[PDB]
């Protein structure tokens, strides 16, 4: 961007909205590419600050989510805290 931004909440309401929409599309585009490049299945669920829902899936959403509930082995599970630590080492 014209300027680097830090990853902390955007306080200007207008700006935050413009950013959500633009970065949300960019996220879905990356997810689409990952699903095609590497033959995988992806479901993405996003609730904005007003609790409106936005969603993407490379196949039927409900099937991916059921497959998640049926999974029973340890596996990579990241959260906002986890990813913070990870970047701090790198």
């Amino acid at each position: 961007g014209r300027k680097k931004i830090q990853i902390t909440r955007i306080m200007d309401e207008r700006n935050r909205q413009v950013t959500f929409t633009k970065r949300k599309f960019g996220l879905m585009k990356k997810a689409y590419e990952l699903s095609v490049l590497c033959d995988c299945e992806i479901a993405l669920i996003i609730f904005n600050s007003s609790n409106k829902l936005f969603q993407y899936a490379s196949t039927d959403m409900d099937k991916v989510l059921l497959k998640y509930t049926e999974y029973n082995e340890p596996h990579e599970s990241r959260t906002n805290s986890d990813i913070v630590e990870a970047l701090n080492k790198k």
Partner: protein, 105 residues
């Protein structure tokens, strides 16, 4: 004089009590008869011996209601998560059912 049903629930409740104590006990010289054996079982965090399945049994009974986001009871937090997962699964199967009832008509 209590029904075998109540009496089994009481027995499970007491085992639970015993497990939640041994989970938070830092007193190496504890005088509670079951503490030592129980702390030994808990220390089966070695992953893998005395089956961990027995322990997860008790935790399950416990997990039904341990509310603190930070229980020290082996597996509690994990079991609470799997119970939410299961609840999600029912919801998904229901919605899926409805879409097909609608589709088949």
């Amino acid at each position: 004089h209590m029904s075998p049903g109540d009496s089994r629930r009481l027995s499970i409740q007491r085992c639970i009590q015993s497990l939640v104590h041994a989970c938070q006990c830092r007193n190496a010289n504890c005088s509670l008869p079951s503490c030592q054996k129980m702390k030994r079982v808990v220390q089966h965090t070695k992953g893998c011996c005395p089956i961990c399945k027995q322990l997860i049994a008790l935790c399950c009974y416990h997990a039904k209601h341990c509310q603190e986001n930070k229980c020290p009871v082996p597996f509690c937090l994990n079991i609470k998560q799997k119970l939410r997962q299961q609840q999600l699964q029912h919801r998904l199967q229901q919605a899926q059912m409805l879409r097909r009832r609608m589709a088949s008509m």
